[PDB]
């Protein structure tokens, strides 16, 4: 089958080169550039993986994990933290995320989370 | 049954009250004070749960939780790390350890733990 990644992150070339390399390592994957937005995805398609900039224009990305979650989900997601920085994951991003990646991202750090998911 | 804790920690003061706490909720706990001493438990007997303070005076817990976890275990342990502390949680952190608690500890944010554990 296809994985299907939600990518969360408001710099357009930053989202289309994530989302070409989850694309060559055989997710489909569509990008939204807030957290309004990833809420409104979230409402309505249904996905495997999400993965969130922790630095959002209208939120904290550890704000909007706990949003996401709490939508009504027919199968859950995981959730993956997407940070420039010991700095921005504390005690509940350890506990909110499954996955961790740092900037910046490329196919060798991608790839193990991806065999995890499936 | 009983769970099975090991605590690493090296005041003998806090070790023994949280040994307290841990039996309180229904586990049997070791306490030990050092990095090396936590590896020499670790070879010999089996844990449920292992937790481990973040400052030790022989090695960090971070450093001390890689070498746990690559121990041959009939079984394997939960580890949970125990910190004064964002500032003490980087990635590997959130990737290595199951649980985190922060100081003080005490019975209310140790008995989910303990229930997930079980």
Request: contains cysteine; negative net charge; glycine residues 6%.
């Amino acid at each position: 089958s296809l994985q299907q990644a939600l990518i969360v992150e408001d710099y357009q070339a930053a989202a289309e080169t994530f989302k070409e390399l989850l694309e060559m390592l055989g997710f489909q994957a569509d990008y939204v550039m807030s957290g309004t937005d990833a809420l409104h995805a979230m409402s309505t398609r249904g996905y495997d993986a999400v993965f969130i900039d922790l630095n959002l224009p209208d939120t904290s990305g550890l704000a909007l994990v706990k949003q996401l979650r709490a939508l009504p989900m027919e199968k859950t997601s995981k959730f993956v933290a997407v940070s420039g920085f010991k700095n921005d994951l504390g005690k509940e991003a350890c506990e909110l995320f499954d996955f961790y990646l740092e900037k910046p991202i490329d196919i060798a750090s991608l790839e193990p989370i991806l065999q995890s998911i499936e």
